[PDB]
């Protein structure tokens, strides 16, 4: 979780 690279996405697609 936490560490997530959000250059071209906002978050995971799973919810």
């Amino acid at each position: 979780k936490l560490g997530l690279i959000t250059n071209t996405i906002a978050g995971v697609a799973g919810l």
Partner: antibody, heavy 113, light 112 residues
Framework: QVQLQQSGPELVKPGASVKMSCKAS????????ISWVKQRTGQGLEWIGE????????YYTENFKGRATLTADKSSKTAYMQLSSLTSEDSAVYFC??????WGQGTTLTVSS | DIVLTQSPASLAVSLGQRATISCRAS??????????MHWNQQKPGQPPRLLIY???NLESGVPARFSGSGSGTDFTLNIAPVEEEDAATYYC?????????FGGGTKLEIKR
């Protein structure tokens, strides 16, 4: 630096299934969502879904809801996409990308009898 | 799904000219925070490469030659000026809404 090693070209017959691979290099595997995009030769780009190694969270688009199966082995920092019940219309190039930031060379899939 | 319409389908240009590609959203592509409109650059036989993310942000490695603008549902890729290695097919793409979708693409070609 981010690097995506995708399995070689795949030749299989209709009704079968394939498990394509994508080996991530240069980054902490759990930081990047793995995106799966389809491009039918000469056509545009189609998002299939994604596997997030951080929480194994996944998303499937309606057209791959039953067929596809996204997975990953944190051990070898590799992510797989499995497509089942293949048809001639599944014949395309399949990219895996670190959340649209970087894209592998892709895997050309040729379904035929 | 949210439809991203991209024009022109083909853009004839001359080496040196500037180039404006357009991408229009079906709905406002702003999430609670940023706007996830992205421009990709794909050449024959190769995978696409990221040029611009979040509307205006230059991906690492891409030259100041490329520029991104727009807001809400109207976005523009700006190449000033055009080079040999720029000649190819350009895609836009949204990530605000979901499912995530791409534009039909634009073919950047030489005028003669």
């Amino acid at each position: 630096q981010v690097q995506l090693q995708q399995s070689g070209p795949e030749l299989v017959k209709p009704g079968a299934s394939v498990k394509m691979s994508c080996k991530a290099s240069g980054y902490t595997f759990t930081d990047y969502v793995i995106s799966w995009v389809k491009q039918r030769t000469g056509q545009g780009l189609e998002w299939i879904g994604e596997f997030y190694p951080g929480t194994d969270s996944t998303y499937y688009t309606e057209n791959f809801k039953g067929r596809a199966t996204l997975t990953a082995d944190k051990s070898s920092k590799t992510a797989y996409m499995q497509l089942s019940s293949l048809t001639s219309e599944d014949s395309a190039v399949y990219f895996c990308a670190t959340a649209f930031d970087y894209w592998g060379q892709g895997t050309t899939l040729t379904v035929s009898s | 799904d949210i439809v991203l319409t991209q024009s022109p389908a083909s853009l004839a240009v001359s080496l040196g000219q500037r180039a404006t590609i357009s991408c229009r959203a079906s709905k406002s592509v702003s999430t609670s925070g940023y706007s996830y409109m992205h421009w990709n650059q794909q050449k024959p036989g190769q995978p696409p490469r990221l040029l611009i993310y979040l509307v205006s942000n230059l991906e690492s490695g891409v030259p100041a030659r490329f520029s991104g603008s727009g807001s809400g549902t109207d976005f523009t890729l700006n190449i000033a000026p055009v080079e040999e290695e720029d000649a190819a097919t350009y895609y836009c793409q949204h990530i605000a809404e979901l499912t995530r979708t791409f534009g039909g693409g634009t073919k950047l070609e030489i005028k003669r």
